[PDB]
Every structure is written in C-alpha cells, then in structure tokens.
C-alpha cells in the first residue's frame, strides 16, 4: 500500500520462519572452554565475569559470558537463563549481539558472544555527558527496528538501557544481554528489569506485554538526549514513586518534536502509549522526530555513524583462572542448555 509496509510484513514473515526453526531445534554444545584463550575481563554480570577470549583455531575474538550454575539457581534465574540462550541462538538481526557458541561444564554455563570493540554505550554516554538529538536518533532508530523485529517473534526484551547496548567498529548498536527476554503471547507478570527503565504497569504488579519495551525506549531516548534519565533518585523506591506519578519534565533544550515523541512513549496509560496503538510501531516510525530517518538505510548500515570507537583501553580487573569443579552442579536444571 504501504508498499513500504508490505515489504516490512514480508521480511518479518521470512524472519519468523528462520527464527522458528531455530527456536524449535536449538543449537547446543557447540564448543569447549579449552578452545578459547582467555585474555582479560571485559566486565561482570550477576553470575560471573564476561571475558575477552580468542578462539584458538580461528583467531577470532569473542566476549565469553560465564554463568556460575549454582549462582543462577540461588537467584531463581534458571528459567530466565534458559530463555536467554534459547532465544539468543535463534534470533538474527543486524543490531542484536550474536551468540556464536554455547556450552557448559561441571560448574558453569558459557555463552560466547560476538565481540564489539566499542564496549557499552553507557560508558561513552556518561563520559561525553549527553548525545545531541541527531546522535540519539541514530541509536533510537536501530532500537525501533530491533523491537519491531523481536516483537514480531512474540519476544519481549525487558532490559533496555545503555549498559546493554554495545557500539561496534562501524559505530552501530548491538543489543546485548537476553537474560530477561521471553517468548510470550499475551501477558506476563515477572517483576524484572532495571528500576529507572521499568514501565508503570510493571511496578504496579498489573500484568504486561511488549508495551513495556516501548516505554523503556522512551527512557533511553530521554537519557541519551539529556545525559540523565527522566526518573532518578538515590533509592529505587523513590524512582518508582516518580514513574507512576504520571509526571515528567524535559530539559529546556529538548526540541518540541522530541518532547512530543517522549510524551507518547512515556505514557502511563497503556491505551495511549505509542507502539501499543492500532498502527503499532508505525506511530513511532512515522513520528515527526524521525522524519529524516531512512529506515532501510539504517537497516543495511549505509548511514554514517556520528561516533566511531577509538581504534590497552579496558578497566583493569584482578584476573583469576576459571575453577571447574570435579562434580557436575545443577545438571538436571540446565539439561537443555
């Protein structure tokens, strides 16, 4: 019609078929720890270090997420962790970090991720202070397309924030960390996410859907463009009071277009929140603030990035060797991993 929208609906149809075959037949046990030279800690998550590694027989570099199995059980994250790996090995999209290999041993789960030399958007955002709107828009557009992709697969992402967005060598985004991703038709109830980014319906124990991802996009755009999030305080409890209060103030330098997009994304009323209406994602894609955005050009990476990572430069850590136990821990819990 809608010649554009028809090309969208056909691409998504084929993508969903690729995803479904992998969703039903997950890749499993595709490597071993001794095939990877462990170089240094890139960062940390709840369940272990994320290591910079080199695959010995190819010389490729990856980020290897280690997950202590006992720590996953103790944090009651077994099902979320199985979701994470099953979803991540099945999706395929330019702005999604690829799960190149996964495996486990007696002690750990390992997820061998595509490596982004730029690291986390969070680091660059805090250092520079804030992104100008064209810079923020470039990143936002990639998130818009990625949520359109994921939501068509019945996937909710549930942990959007700058900490989880990596900058690649071309200056584009890769969404990392699928720890809370979930394939659900209809509503779900888990209280999970990051306080500053929680939609009101989550805080209110209301039952929710993909619209929490669109609210979270509003927080991210705001934080990228302002240098601070729209709702912050010293304690999460004070953050939640502001989120549900129905109130938000924009910096004096936000364009009126930006403020209008964010008022429709940061809408406490689900029935009025952009992304959740009759036109779905297109109330966002066709918004004023995105008028200069060439969505196809973004997808095929023809747009010049506003920022390319400085071509050594990592936060130092104390580095200890991986200890693999003599006995298998939590074998039945993670059987399908």
């Amino acid at each position: 019609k809608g010649s554009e929208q028809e090309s969208v609906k056909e691409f998504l149809a084929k993508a969903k078929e690729d995803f479904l075959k992998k969703w039903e037949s997950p890749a499993q046990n595709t490597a071993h720890l001794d095939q990877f030279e462990r170089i240094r800690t890139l960062g940390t998550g709840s369940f272990g270090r994320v290591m910079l590694v080199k695959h010995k027989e190819t010389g490729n570099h990856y980020a290897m997420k280690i997950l202590d199995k006992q720590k996953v059980v103790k944090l009651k994250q077994i099902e979320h962790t199985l979701n994470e790996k099953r979803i991540q090995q099945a999706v395929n999209f330019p702005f999604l970090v690829k799960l190149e290999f996964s495996f486990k041993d007696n002690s750990n789960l390992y997820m061998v991720l595509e490596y982004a030399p730029g690291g986390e958007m969070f680091s660059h955002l805090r250092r520079i202070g804030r992104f100008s709107e064209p810079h923020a828009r470039f990143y936002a557009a990639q998130i818009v397309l990625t949520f359109e992709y994921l939501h068509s697969l019945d996937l909710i992402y549930r942990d959007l924030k700058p900490e989880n967005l990596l900058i690649d060598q071309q200056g584009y985004i890769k969404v990392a960390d699928f720890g809370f991703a979930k394939r659900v038709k209809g509503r779900t109830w888990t209280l999970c996410g990051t306080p500053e980014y929680l939609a009101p319906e989550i805080i209110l124990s209301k039952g929710y859907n993909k619209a929490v991802d669109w609210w979270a996009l509003g927080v991210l755009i705001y934080e990228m463009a302002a240098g601070y999030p729209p709702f912050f305080a010293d304690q999460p409890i004070q953050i939640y009071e502001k989120i549900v209060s129905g109130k938000v103030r924009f910096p004096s330098h936000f364009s009126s277009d930006l403020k209008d997009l964010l008022r429709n994304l940061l809408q406490v009323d689900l029935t009025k929140r952009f992304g959740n209406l009759k036109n779905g994602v297109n109330d966002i894609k066709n918004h004023k603030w995105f008028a200069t955005t060439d969505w196809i050009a973004i997808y095929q990476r023809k747009v010049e990035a506003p920022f390319i990572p400085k071509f050594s430069n990592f936060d130092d850590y104390e580095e200890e060797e991986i200890r693999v136990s003599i006995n298998e821990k939590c074998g039945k819990e993670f059987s399908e991993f």
């Binding site: 709840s46 944090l75 009651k76 994250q77 969070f122 805090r126 202070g129 942990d159 924030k161 900490e163 720890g179 809370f180 888990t190 209280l191 999970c192 996410g193 990051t194 306080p195 500053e196 929680l198 302002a226 240098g227 601070y228 999030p229 912050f232 305080a233 010293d234 999460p236 910096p251």
Partner: peptide, 20 residues
C-alpha cells in the same frame, strides 16, 4: 541543575537489574 543532582546521586554507575 538537574544534571548536577544526577551527577551527585548514587545511581550514575552501571545499574543492576532487579530480580524480585
């Protein structure tokens, strides 16, 4: 300024997810 209030706050580092 709001920026100054943010920078002086305890939530300018990497933020942990909640797990309930």
């Amino acid at each position: 300024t709001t920026y100054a209030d943010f920078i002086a706050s305890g939530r300018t580092g990497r933020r942990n997810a909640i797990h309930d």
